[PDB]
Structure formats: C-alpha cells, structure tokens
C-alpha cells in the first residue's frame, strides 16, 4: 500500500489528478489478478496422499 502511495506522490507532482491515479490502479489490479489466475494450476486432481504434501509445503512457509 505504501509502495502505491510512493509512486502516486511522484505522479501528483507531475500534475495528474488524484482520481486519474486511482482509476489507473483499479484497472491495473484486475489485470494482475487475471494474469496470475491463468498461471496457477489445480492440485485437486491429486489423491489424499499427495494433498497432505501440499499442506506441508505452505505450512513451512508461514512458520
């Protein structure tokens, strides 16, 4: 969030209206989510034996 505000301060000094800055972030947010959604894959095809492995993978990262 602060990174978005740091890049917005540079655009405000250039004379851009703040609403035009917020309108660009809303359109760019949906383009990033739709791009990452196509790259990921579905792990639900695996059985319960492999499904436990994916739970161990994301556990060690949050710890």
């Amino acid at each position: 969030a602060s990174a978005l505000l740091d890049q917005a301060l540079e655009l405000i000094q250039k004379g851009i209206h703040p609403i035009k800055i917020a309108n660009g972030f809303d359109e760019a947010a949906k383009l990033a989510i739709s791009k990452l959604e196509e790259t990921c894959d579905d792990i639900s095809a695996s059985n319960d034996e492999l499904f436990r492995d994916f739970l161990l993978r994301a556990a060690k990262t949050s710890l």
């Binding site: 209206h17 703040p18 609403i19 035009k20």
Partner: protein, 49 residues
Amino acid sequence: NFGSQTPTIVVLKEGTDASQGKGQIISNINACVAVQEALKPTLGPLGSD
C-alpha cells in the same frame, strides 16, 4: 440618590453582542461562503473528500 455612583442603566444584559452599523448582514454572507469553500472541491465524480 442612594449613592454617589448612580450607575447608568444598560438596556441589555452584559455579554450581548452588537449589530446594525455596516457589515452585519455581510458577516452572515462570509460565514456561508467559507463553509461553501469546503464543499466546492467535493462536487463532481473527480472531486475530493
């Protein structure tokens, strides 16, 4: 006659403001314009908060 002071009676209780003269109704206009100054930039979809 009850004292050498003999105070002068004031029509209104102490603390009351004054009026008439010139600019009394103008004081009410500048009060509404100053409040309007805050609500002007909030007009329009590109307005601020």
